[PDB]
Ligand binder design. Structure first.
Ligand SMILES: C[C@H]1O[C@H](O)[C@@H](O)[C@@H](O)[C@@H]1O
Ligand SMILES: C[C@H]1O[C@H](O)[C@@H](O)[C@@H](O)[C@@H]1O
Ligand SMILES: C[C@H]1O[C@H](O)[C@@H](O)[C@@H](O)[C@@H]1O
Length: 254
């Protein structure tokens, strides 16, 4: 895996790896968070905090000691750190060895939430996905289907219940676009879309509570570039056999 999911913990020699296999970020049993090149050359570290330590992705990437204190932190510059950000923010380790933190706000949703869903889990539908009639996605007791008849439907699986639909009869494709929009089409005719064309790539989240949201990557911080006041344009990365988060890369300079 090349990423860390919200709240993920790693410790005692657990690690992630850049898509190309060259860089590895390992939270060591001696409590040193270390970036390795080719498996053998360490090229960055926190330095060790000692045994019983751990690293957790919780808005910041935070290094804790046995005693439960934070010993090192990404120290991402934030207005507020709302507890819900810790449930949302994720990290990617990329092919030139940089790693960065994303915290993305929903741009669109099948429904408007009065407040965050506790312990919700998102099935990520990545930028560039083209759904074709017959495509479906399953998360818990819900199913997102792009149907033979062109409708995009969210069903509760057992018992079977329609929760939401677009009624885009005759659509032959739905595209999660690089420009930021999610668009259902017959041919080149857009029958329905989210109105989120920003030029920052889209991805979708399909929840285990029967909801769909579109977000776009908002890169806040990298190891090499520190905190970023404006999020740069990033590009879909190589989805891994299973990663749980979106995967991106970002340019080295301008
Ligand atoms: C699987 C679904 O596929 C069709 O497209 C639609 O009309 C439904 O009647 C059917 O249940
Ligand atoms: C929401 C419903 O809308 C249409 O009736 C058709 O696409 C069905 O299969 C679908 O379940
Ligand atoms: C509805 C249209 O909105 C934007 O122009 C762009 O996202 C197009 O691809 C889209 O189809």
């Amino acid at each position: 895996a090349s990423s860390l999911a919200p709240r993920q913990v790693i410790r005692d020699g657990q690690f992630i790896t850049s898509p190309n296999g060259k860089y590895k970020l390992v939270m060591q049993a001696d409590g040193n968070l270390v970036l390795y090149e080719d498996g053998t050359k360490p090229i960055w570290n926190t330095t060790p905090v000692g045994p019983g330590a751990k690293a957790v992705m919780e808005f910041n990437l935070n290094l804790y000691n046995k005693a439960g204190q934070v010993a090192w932190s990404s120290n991402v510059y934030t207005a507020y750190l709302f507890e819900e950000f810790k449930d949302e923010a994720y990290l990617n380790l990329q092919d030139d060895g940089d790693f960065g933190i994303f915290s993305d706000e929903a741009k669109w949703g099948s429904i408007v939430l009065s407040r965050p869903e506790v312990g919700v889990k998102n099935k990520i539908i990545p930028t560039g996905t083209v759904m074709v009639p017959g495509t479906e996605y399953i998360n818990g007791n819900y199913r997102l289907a792009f149907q033979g008849d062109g409708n995009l439907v969210i069903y509760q699986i057992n018992p079977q219940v329609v929760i939401w639909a677009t009624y885009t009869m005759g659509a032959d494709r739905a595209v999660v676009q690089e420009d930021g929009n999610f668009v259902i089409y017959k041919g080149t005719t857009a029958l329905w879309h989210t109105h989120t064309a920003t030029g920052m790539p889209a991805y979708l989240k399909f929840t285990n509570t029967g909801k769909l949201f579109l977000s776009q990557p908002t890169l806040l911080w990298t190891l090499k570039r520190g905190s970023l006041s404006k999020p740069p344009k990033v590009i879909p990365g190589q989805h891994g056999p299973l990663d749980t988060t979106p995967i991106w890369s970002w340019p080295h300079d301008y």
